[PDB]
Amino acid sequence: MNISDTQVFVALVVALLPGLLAFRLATELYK
Amino acid sequence: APFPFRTIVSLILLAGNILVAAIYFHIIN
């Protein structure tokens, strides 16, 4: 039994935080 | 020059190789 719709959506929402932090780190390194 | 350190290290390594060969040729066990 694989994960459900809610788990996929929760993973997608959680992955936003590393994405934003990666953008912040990239812009800081570009400085 | 006799090269003391070089020849001592070389002889130690050669003695190790000879001992391995002697084990390998069933001279010693």
């Binding site: 993973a11 932090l21 990666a22 | 390998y24």
Partner: protein, 739 residues
């Protein structure tokens, strides 16, 4: 000028397309950036390392999430020997119904890829059982990547930017990385094995909800503090134990049984736990060697600069001058990177060599395609890491080495007898190549003329003797571990040879990869491997030692690591830079790893066929390799799609061609050189300028790729084609032919 690249005004003022290309090729060469200081360099590197760690964690999280979402982990648990693991689902909206049907397999109702990375076996061995656990791990790794990204951002803020002295403090870093990064991590992994992995392998569920009040051993922690450690080794798993069940399951948490678990044909989990406990203890002990803040401990600079051996006068360790080296390594990031890359390459080679012969994961030894893919993957990575180690050694020679601070030490002596070093490497390479190729073609001619008995077939007696000394009784030698009465086998003073029974059982097993039987073909291919290693080392060492200069170019150090040439004068100086030596050595590294992986794959294919005699009788001449390995095993790969239909190998069939395409493309970049293309581009520029209705116009003047850029692009195409072609062939010939 343009804003891009921000780090180079010379490139920013370039009015041609080259400005873009070089901007990508020099972005991570922080030392050459405009207005770069050492402290800023170290801080930027530290933040970039945080970013790379975050990327690695995101990659692991993605693998876990895709397995938990579209894989068949739970179904694969119930039958690891007959269920194909699923990597991820396929969504290619331009498939036909035959392709959809062909790729719908492994119990799925949608097209899927078959996983060959072995992550299913790895997760199964370490106690993972449900898709929910994989999902939780993926979420945790997402959070960890976010944490490391935040740390990378934070340590760039003015109050948290470390000083140069913090980066230069070698002794505390060594202490912390030996005791904490290596030792404490190993102890934590042993704790995970004892508390989670072993109980799960014994059919008992242990998780975050109950691990606090579920002791891993009945004796508890009292046995450890009292000194009754032997209680942890009592009642191991029986030879009839069934993995992931309590049938035949023991209670010991730290044994030293040795050999393999009889059912899974892989290393005992308790043995691995005790291994990691011992490694943790050893590394924690090692992490207390150097002096940081309390007086006690060795000072590396003092050891390198020492000139007295208990009163006697010596030039240094082994009577060799090592003085001034502490500042040389400490101030040269390229030197440290060279050791780091060399160590990682050796470790990757060791991983490849020790994982197929001693599988650590349950049933992974019976997944032939997974074994082949893992071995080839880690060996090629090791080759790349070695090439990088020597390339950055050359970069150190050019950029960071200064003769006066290294006067008289061993590095200076190496630079001073570089000629002897290179000449002797060339001699070894010539001898190996001449005699190996001559014996190969002699055997080829004899077999072609119906005289296979006239082949020169040199027995690998030394390696066979080593195998016998390790316990292989097949060859008839009666030395060391193959002699039950030997001093080594009995271990007369203590008889603590608790490894010998299981180790001998694994060694003398005829159905595993532990010290495979070897003959003349193995001898010849090992000497070919030695030739490849020596030639690649010759190229890399000649590039590194001649990086500062040679008779042809006495002032090479003033031109940098990577430059095209020094013109057609003085006879011509094409490919004279050390970068060009690394470029040339990549070809030889690819050739050597091709030989190594060909040997491994053909031997294991013969073993898995039940046709070992084919390899034994055909590997002694090169036509045997050409016919019985490549031509014979390419049939299923090239029949993945044909005028009669398609099957699951179609992708490999296509990719096999794709690699062959990329390889071909590289030749165009490697044979044809710049001026031809520059003149052609000039003609095309005229054509565009004189054509009506073509309102477009270049903002960057189109020019042909530079000489060094062309070499790099050709090498990239060559390597990509090499890897893609061999990977497609490997997967198709192993998977389409076996389970």
């Amino acid at each position: 000028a343009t804003k891009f690249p921000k780090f180079s005004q010379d490139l920013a003022q370039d009015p041609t397309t080259r400005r873009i290309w070089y901007a990508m090729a020099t972005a991570h060469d922080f030392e050459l950036h405009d207005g770069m200081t050492e402290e800023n360099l170290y801080q930027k590197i530290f933040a970039s390392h945080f970013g790379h760690l975050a990327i690695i964690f995101l990659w692991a999280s993605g693998v876990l999430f895709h397995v938990a979402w579209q894989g068949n982990f739970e179904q694969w648990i119930k039958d690891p020997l007959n269920v194909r693991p699923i990597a991820h689902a396929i969504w290619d909206a331009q498939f036909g119904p035959p392709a959809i049907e062909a790729f719908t397999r492994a119990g799925a109702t949608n097209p899927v890829d078959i996983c060959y990375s072995g992550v299913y076996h790895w997760w199964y061995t370490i106690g993972m059982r449900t898709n929910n656990e994989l999902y939780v791990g993926a979420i945790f790794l997402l959070l960890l990547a976010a944490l490391f990204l935040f740390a990378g951002w934070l340590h760039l803020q003015p109050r948290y930017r470390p000083t140069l002295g913090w980066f230069k403090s070698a002794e505390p870093r060594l202490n912390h990385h030996l005791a904490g990064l290596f030792g404490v991590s190993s102890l934590a992994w042993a704790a995970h094995l004892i508390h989670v992995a072993i109980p799960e392998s014994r059919g008992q569920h242990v998780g975050w909800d109950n691990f606090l009040f579920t002791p891993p051993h009945p004796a508890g922690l009292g046995a450890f503090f009292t000194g009754n450690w032997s209680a942890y080794a009592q009642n191991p798993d029986t030879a009839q134990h069934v993995f992931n069940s309590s049938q035949g399951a023991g209670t010991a948490i730290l044994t030293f049984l040795g050999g393999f678990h009889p059912q899974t044909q892989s290393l005992w989990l308790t043995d691995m736990a005790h291994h990691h406990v011992a490694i943790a203890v050893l590394f924690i002990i090692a992490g207390h060697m150097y002096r940081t803040n309390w007086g006690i401990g060795h000072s590396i600079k003092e050891m390198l600069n020492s000139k007295s051996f208990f009163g006697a006068k010596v030039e240094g360790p082994f009577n060799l001058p090592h003085q001034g080296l502490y500042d040389t390594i400490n101030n040269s990031l390229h030197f440290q990177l060279s050791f780091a890359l060399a160590a990682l390459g050796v470790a990757s080679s060791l991983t490849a060599q020790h994982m197929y012969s001693m599988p650590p994961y349950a049933f992974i030894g019976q997944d032939f395609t997974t074994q082949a893919a893992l071995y080839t993957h880690h060996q090629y990575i090791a080759g790349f890491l070695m090439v990088g180690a020597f390339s950055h050694a050359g970069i150190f020679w050019i950029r960071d080495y200064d003769p006066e601070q290294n006067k008289g030490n061993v590095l200076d002596r190496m630079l001073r007898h570089k000629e002897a070093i290179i000449s002797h490497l060339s001699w070894v390479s010539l001898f190996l190549g001449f005699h190996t190729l001559g014996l190969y073609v002699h055997n080829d001619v004899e077999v072609a003329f119906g005289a296979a008995e006239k082949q020169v077939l040199i027995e690998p007696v030394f390696a066979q003797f080593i195998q016998a000394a390790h316990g292989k009784a097949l060859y008839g030698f009666n030395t060391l571990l193959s002699n039950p009465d030997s001093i080594a086998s009995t271990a007369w003073p203590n008889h603590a040879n608790v490894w010998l029974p299981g180790w001998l059982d694994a060694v003398n097993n005829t159905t595993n990869s532990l010290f495979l039987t070897i003959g003349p073909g193995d001898f010849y291919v090992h000497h070919a491997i030695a030739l490849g290693l020596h030639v690649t080392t010759l190229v890399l060492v000649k590039g590194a030692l001649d990086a500062r200069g040679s008779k042809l170019m006495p002032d090479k150090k003033d031109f940098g690591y990577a430059f095209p040439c020094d013109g057609p004068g003085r006879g011509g100086t094409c490919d004279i830079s050390a970068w060009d030596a690394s470029y040339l050595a990549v070809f030889w590294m690819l050739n050597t790893l091709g030989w190594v992986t060909f040997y491994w794959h053909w031997k294991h294919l013969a073993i898995w066929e039940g046709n070992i005699a084919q390899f034994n009788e055909s590997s002694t001449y090169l036509m045997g390799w050409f016919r019985d390995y490549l031509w014979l095993h390419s049939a299923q790969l090239i029949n993945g799609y044909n005028p009669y239909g398609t099957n699951s190998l179609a992708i490999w069939s296509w990719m096999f061609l794709w690699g062959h395409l990329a390889w071909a493309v590289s030749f165009m970049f490697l044979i044809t050189w710049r001026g031809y293309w520059q003149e052609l581009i000039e003609t095309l520029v005229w054509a565009h300028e004189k054509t009506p209705l073509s309102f477009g116009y270049w903002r960057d003047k189109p020019v042909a790729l530079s000489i060094v850029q062309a070499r790099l692009v050709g090498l990239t195409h060559f390597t990509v084609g090499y890897i893609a072609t061999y990977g497609a062939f490997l997967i198709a010939s192993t998977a389409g032919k076996f389970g």
